[PDB]
Scaffold this active site. Structure first.
Site, PDB file in Angstrom:
ATOM      1  N   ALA A   1       4.959  -7.901  -1.842  1.00 22.78           N
ATOM      2  CA  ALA A   1       5.252  -7.027  -0.711  1.00 22.78           C
ATOM      3  C   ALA A   1       6.582  -7.392  -0.095  1.00 22.78           C
ATOM      4  CB  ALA A   1       4.164  -7.137   0.334  1.00 22.78           C
TER       5      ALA A   1
ATOM      6  N   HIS B   1      -7.814   7.662  -7.535  1.00 21.43           N
ATOM      7  CA  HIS B   1      -7.555   6.233  -7.445  1.00 21.43           C
ATOM      8  C   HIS B   1      -7.942   5.741  -6.068  1.00 21.43           C
ATOM      9  CE1 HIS B   1      -4.039   8.293  -5.775  1.00 21.43           C
ATOM     10  NE2 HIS B   1      -3.866   7.260  -4.976  1.00 21.43           N
TER      11      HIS B   1
ATOM     12  N   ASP C   1      -0.488  -4.931  -6.419  1.00 20.42           N
ATOM     13  CA  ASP C   1       0.894  -5.004  -5.943  1.00 20.42           C
ATOM     14  C   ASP C   1       1.362  -6.266  -5.270  1.00 20.42           C
ATOM     15  OD1 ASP C   1       1.832  -2.069  -6.529  1.00 20.42           O
ATOM     16  OD2 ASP C   1      -0.083  -1.910  -5.473  1.00 20.42           O
TER      17      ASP C   1
ATOM     18  N   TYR D   1       5.148   4.936  -4.863  1.00 23.14           N
ATOM     19  CA  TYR D   1       4.703   5.015  -3.477  1.00 23.14           C
ATOM     20  C   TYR D   1       5.295   4.032  -2.522  1.00 23.14           C
TER      21      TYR D   1
ATOM     22  N   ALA E   1       7.458   1.442  -6.947  1.00 19.20           N
ATOM     23  CA  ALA E   1       7.739   2.531  -7.865  1.00 19.20           C
ATOM     24  C   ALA E   1       7.625   3.876  -7.162  1.00 19.20           C
ATOM     25  CB  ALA E   1       6.797   2.483  -9.058  1.00 19.20           C
TER      26      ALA E   1
ATOM     27  N   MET F   1       9.493  -6.146  -2.786  1.00 15.69           N
ATOM     28  CA  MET F   1       9.620  -4.673  -2.798  1.00 15.69           C
ATOM     29  C   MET F   1       9.976  -4.048  -1.456  1.00 15.69           C
ATOM     30  SD  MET F   1       6.158  -3.480  -4.853  1.00 15.69           S
ATOM     31  CE  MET F   1       4.958  -4.596  -4.159  1.00 15.69           C
TER      32      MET F   1
HETATM   33 CU    CU Z   1      -3.035   7.453  -3.178  1.00 15.26          CU
END
Ligand code: CU
Ligand code: CU
Lengths: 655, 655
Positions: A308, A439, A302, A388, A386, A311
């Site tokens: 960071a 994950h 990300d 989270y 997206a 977003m």
């Molecule tokens: Cu998670």
């Protein structure tokens, strides 16, 4: 443009424009587009000389990344804002850059209008005339060996909403369209051998109206808990420079890393002592654990693939920060070279943190007692990737400790599950026909220390029983134990992992100095425990593209511009090649003992989804701390006014 | 006396007195003294039957421990309060009980008046006429093989104050007097081979007047941060029974464990589901790591040797608990059989805990968004064990999780250090002539579960990469990973430790039920990471007296009265014998799968002192959590009124 108050201040909207104008001119007649326009921080040496040795103000520089229509890859370089000129430029034809919200936002419409995608939807049970109910989260392709970096690609995780207000995640589709970013068209669709049509179940929604329908009604509003600071806050901000509880530092911010704290120091009763020159999150990787195609492509970095900063959520509106808040705005450049602003990207404030310390004498039944409460300074940001959200909190404390709290919330990435399909061992069925794959969320904390000055070192600290056995003259009762310090001499020595067996911690210290009491060098100790081992096998896509993630700690020599461990341009890089951490490590023989070093710490969590996480997940906490040990000669917050305090003599007077 | 509202309610001052009177009468003509008069909680089965099957109110019983002049050991038994009669009694002649503040408080004066002691003071450089400046922390002897349990002994850690308002800990003396508790007289003095006289440095003090002197002045009072709950609190207490956010439980308290939470359940939208039948801290051990005599005797099991209830601080005065607080008092018995009260021993209240969850859609630039803040319920207590304070916080949260936060503060245990003596590897020189030895603070969390009902099991959960290698059809890209569940079948199977290599967590679950979505049984997961290995060698005094501390987890079959893992009477037990955990474990062959079990978790920290901890140490945190996983079918706090919420359609109307 006009110079900033401080050399580390992010570029202003004017500097951004002056830069884009300068570049457009340089590439006159060329059809260029802007991917990134950000501050190129001054050299560490230059900065420090300017700050402490009356050195000159460093040049105000801007770093850019552009795309030229019809050209492969990108072009990057520097603009010297003062002379408005491109002073450095180069083309990287075999690389792909970070995905801005602009290259990302068009994707949904393109797959919606693609005949192939439309046919798959119809096949999936969604009429061609309802494509307006088909949504998708645009992701980097991550890496797909079928195309390498030959085409800038994205993969679209497809979902379906029966109503715009629905949370689409309960209804994922089974196929995955591959989209050419530049050409703006679907060039391939990954289709499973086993087809799964849209779930026919109700969407799993979470807004009040939805809840009222699901469970009888909402819980009654609860009695308020109001926080008020009538006489103001105790911190003082001078531009981006913060001042609180003897701490002083600069609060920066950029498209990639988000918050960047620099020039951190502590006023030790008159003696201003450095601690860190720069600290931030330099990268991440959220590797999924289903081996099934095309889920390997789910291992987002990300920070380096989306940013960071890019977003980040404007903080005000949502009631994210409670109390007397002090905000900061963020400025980037859009595709056109025009400044863009995101208001209240950073939120600053102080809160109660319970007790700082307390002690009472039992002799007079605790009459003799002293209590001092704690208050912490929080510099926060919350970004959305997206599904989270990552809530980040840089916390400074009154004992000299600095802490990083993270809270993960938002929504589980979901994939479709057949009616009689088992979520198997790789994922969990959190709702009918919904599969939430396992994950990990991994982060790479980058620390550029200056512990009490220049010339630092790092060491692993392991708790150990004395080597002598029970019954020996040296350990008669077998209770003896100590702390084993292994200071890293060479890069190779530092590649270490957290070990529960020894309650391992790591010290960043100044070997050139000694604490007058303890005799140990001054230091800041990394107390971090949420250090998951990278579960992806060695040589895997994940392990290769995130070289830094295989170790809890990676310590390398400092070099200007050694910021991103996965490389400067992360999307679609295969993991082959000497760049990033792999390059900084080299043959592992460079010295990192008593010199300028860089410490990269990998921490995070391993997520095995449970229904409790759906359809919206409750915050999951992650934390790590850097405490001063042997830095001070006694508790540093003892001159803070106590909440209560009764001396023994006083307790006597009170009779 | 009169029956309490709830069977689990601690004994009233009335029941305490009715109990001692009953005992005194039974032992009429005997010179007895009271050591402990506390509630003998009802049998788990009887309690549950009464609570859920209309069973009868369990008999109100009191458990007592007395000493009889001229008799060795103690006598214990039960009194049936209703009929005011001793229904059970027995003598334990080779055991020693918990040290009450009464047997502990006389010690300082006795050593002050002992000729031997005085001579040592004179030798140490303190005139015989200044013995009023000599202080001492009275400790259990712990265990000394020279006397066993043949005499009730204490060891005095001797210190010196040049002024009564001093913090004595910067001035420890080199010798250690042994005192006969009953006889009230010094029977032996441990003197080191190397003598070290009183330090001639200034005391290291911490009150404002001291600080003003030390550093120029105190920091200016800081702007206040006021917390107000104008409309009241959201929790409801009916007696000791608390109700908050669907949680419901009984808040008990006793001389030993301190706070005891019982009958914990959650109202799952009308379905009231049990979680824990009882949970509390059952024992501790704080083993020091200097192998030098007599420092082996420093390994206090505070809960069993002094009592977390007996040492608890009245919370009001200090400003310990900020906000709208609700207190509880504690009642014990004094040596004479008369009730004693410690006001505001427990403090209850709710605080802000940041975000509970949040999510915004990037499609309309986060206009579509929902934010719900979190509030936590805190039941706290703070006790003082001579030099240190242990702040305990039982925290209930709105996602269904329960957390135990501990904060260590107070003052370092210190021993004298020679001018040219090295604190060696076993301790730290935190101040001239002061040596703070290494040590661990370990705790034994006792959990009696009832996860969604009766019939429970426990398991170890370990994260693992797939067994198939990179490039295999089963794990082509090598990213596959899962969670390995090893459910304990036999007591032996449970003896496990936290492992960083697998990011291990433990599950307490109900094998008789299934989550309708995930297909897993309902459960509460123990997420604990500060699990230090016991550094003391096997066969050591420490390892022997603390059988439970060698493992992060110990799961044994439930049996009425299996509370204290180190035995019922802890002081001076050598550690030889089948009692406590060792007894419950047995040959480790008893079943613990799907039955009534008891889960004891060992957690804590390893303390390597640094000057920052002196002369008063900043709080050090310890936490552990129990999250619901597969307990619910979706996030349980979705029906909490969000702080902010904008629907996608609503964001459109707003234009
Ligand atoms: Cu998670
Ligand atoms: Cu300690």
């Amino acid at each position: 443009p006009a110079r900033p108050a401080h050399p580390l201040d992010p570029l202003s909207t004017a500097e951004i424009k002056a830069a884009t104008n300068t570049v457009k001119s340089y590439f006159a007649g060329k059809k260029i587009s802007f991917n990134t326009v950000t501050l190129r921080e001054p050299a560490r040496k230059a900065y420090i000389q300017w700050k402490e040795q009356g050195g000159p103000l460093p040049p105000r520089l801007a770093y850019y990344v552009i795309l030229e229509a019809g050209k492969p890859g990108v072009k990057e370089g520097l603009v010297d804002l003062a002379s408005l000129s491109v002073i450095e430029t180069r083309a990287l034809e075999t690389v792909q850059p970070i995905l801005t919200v602009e290259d990302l936002c068009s994707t949904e419409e393109v797959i919606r209008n693609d005949p192939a995608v439309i046919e798959q939807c119809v096949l999936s049970g969604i009429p061609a005339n309802e494509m307006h109910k088909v949504y998708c989260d645009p992701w980097t392709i991550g890496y797909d060996e079928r195309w390498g970096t030959g085409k800038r690609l994205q993969q679209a995780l497809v979902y379906y909403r029966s109503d715009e207000d629905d949370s689409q995640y309960s209804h994922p589709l089974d196929f995955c369209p591959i989209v050419d970013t530049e050409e703006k068209k679907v060039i391939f669709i990954d289709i499973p051998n086993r087809r799964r049509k849209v779930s026919k179940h109700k969407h799993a929604n979470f807004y009040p109206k939805h809840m009222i329908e699901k469970v009888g009604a909402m819980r009654p509003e609860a009695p308020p808990i109001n926080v008020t600071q009538p006489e103001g806050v105790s911190f003082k901000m001078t531009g981006n420079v913060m001042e609180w509880s003897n701490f002083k530092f600069h609060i920066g911010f950029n498209y990639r890393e988000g918050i960047v704290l620099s020039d951190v120091s502590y006023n030790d009763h008159g003696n201003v002592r450095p601690i860190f020159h720069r600290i931030s999150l330099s990268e991440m990787i959220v590797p999924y654990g289903s081996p099934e195609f095309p889920h390997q492509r789910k291992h987002a970095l990300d920070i380096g693939e989306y940013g960071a900063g890019y977003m980040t959520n404007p903080l005000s509106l949502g009631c994210d920060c409670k109390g007397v808040i002090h905000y900061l705005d963020a400025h980037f450049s859009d595709r056109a070279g025009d400044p863009i602003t995101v208001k209240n990207a950073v939120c600053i404030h102080e809160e109660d943190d319970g007790l700082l310390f307390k002690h009472s004498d039992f002799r007079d039944n605790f009459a003799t007692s002293l209590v001092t409460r704690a208050t912490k300074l929080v510099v926060s940001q919350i970004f959305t990737a997206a599904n989270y959200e990552y809530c980040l909190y840089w916390v400074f404390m009154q004992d000299g400790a600095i802490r990083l709290d993270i809270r993960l919330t938002g929504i589980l990435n979901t994939y479709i599950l057949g009616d009689d399909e088992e979520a198997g061992p790789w994922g969990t069925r959190v709702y009918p026909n919904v599969n939430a794959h396992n994950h990990q969320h991994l982060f790479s904390l980058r620390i550029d220390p200056r512990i009490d000055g220049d010339g630092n070192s790092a060491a692993a600290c392991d708790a150990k029983s004395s080597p002598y056995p029970l019954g020996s003259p040296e350990n008669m009762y077998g209770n003896a134990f100590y702390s084993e310090k292994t200071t890293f001499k060479t890069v190779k020595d530092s590649l270490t992992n957290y070990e529960s067996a020894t309650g391992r911690s790591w010290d960043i210290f100044n070997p050139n100095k000694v604490n007058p009491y303890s005799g140990k060098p001054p230091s800041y100790k990394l107390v971090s425990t949420q250090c998951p081992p990278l579960l992806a096998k060695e040589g895997s896509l994940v392990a290769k593209r995130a070289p830094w993630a295989s170790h809890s700690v990676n310590v390398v020599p400092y070099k200007d511009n050694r910021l991103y461990p996965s490389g400067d341009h992360v999307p679609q890089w295969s993991g082959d090649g000497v760049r990033g951490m792999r390059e900084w490590i080299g043959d592992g023989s460079e010295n990192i003992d008593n010199t300028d070093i860089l410490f990269f710490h990998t921490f995070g969590i391993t997520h095995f989804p449970a229904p409790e996480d759906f359809p919206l997940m409750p915050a999951e906490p992650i934390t790590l701390m850097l405490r001063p040990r042997h830095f001070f000669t006694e508790n540093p917050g003892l001159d803070i006014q106590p909440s209560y305090a009764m001396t023994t003599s006083e307790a006597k007077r009170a009779v």
